[PDB]
Amino acid sequence: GSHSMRYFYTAMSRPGRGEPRFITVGYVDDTLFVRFDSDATSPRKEPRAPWIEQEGPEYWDRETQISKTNTQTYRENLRTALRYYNQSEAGSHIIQRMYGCDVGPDGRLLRGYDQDAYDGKDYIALNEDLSSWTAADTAAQITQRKWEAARVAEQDRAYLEGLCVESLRRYLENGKETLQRADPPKTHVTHHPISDHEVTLRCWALGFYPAEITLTWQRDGEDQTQDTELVETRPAGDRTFQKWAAVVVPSGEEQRYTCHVQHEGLPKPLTLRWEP
């Protein structure tokens, strides 16, 4: 299948409560594999998946150093963002970054990412060409100008085409047992009367990996989007995910409704009904 690697940074200022906190988490697909927290007792990059544990001591030292340097970089970025937006030093602000690469079944780069946000809004992003930037506003345009002058995009492209897909290839092989195993959803429909002439039909998907799934209800073969309550896909805590979709239907009409399930672990989409 197709795979992704992503690193996620959160840098959060907290005036009066020390220097800004810096957290990094790294994922392959929906699996957390590494974490760093500047508030840790003795901050370092820590393994969070068994298959990364075979990386040698040199890996962990190098990765820890990157995170320590980043803590300083992102603290500077917070100071700079204050200036560019004419903001006071009294407030708490957040910078986020996400970056990494997607690869296909053959392991070749599909596309690269490097995006930053300030206070939950887009700030600057590397374009899909990996050679130019999109700045969200006149503040980010200052950063864009700096990064164009310094040829930052070329250096990101070299990482994204090289080390990013190189390390992801290695992780996928080392973690092949888990990373390259799709667990299909365990599915069932429950039936609960709400009142005399209304019932809730809830279509459940449990125990699936990766998180991507589609659950829909149809009535007489027609999509019921507006009258479907669909919860956000949620982690079970055992690597897997859960989701449900519910529809309120008239009593006696249950057999007109079908739940449809699509997931990479299923060779074909499933069709389910209430089974009395």
Partner: peptide
């Protein structure tokens, strides 16, 4: 693996 270079805003 991460990239060790980061430029500031």
């Amino acid at each position: 693996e991460e990239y060790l270079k980061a430029w500031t805003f």
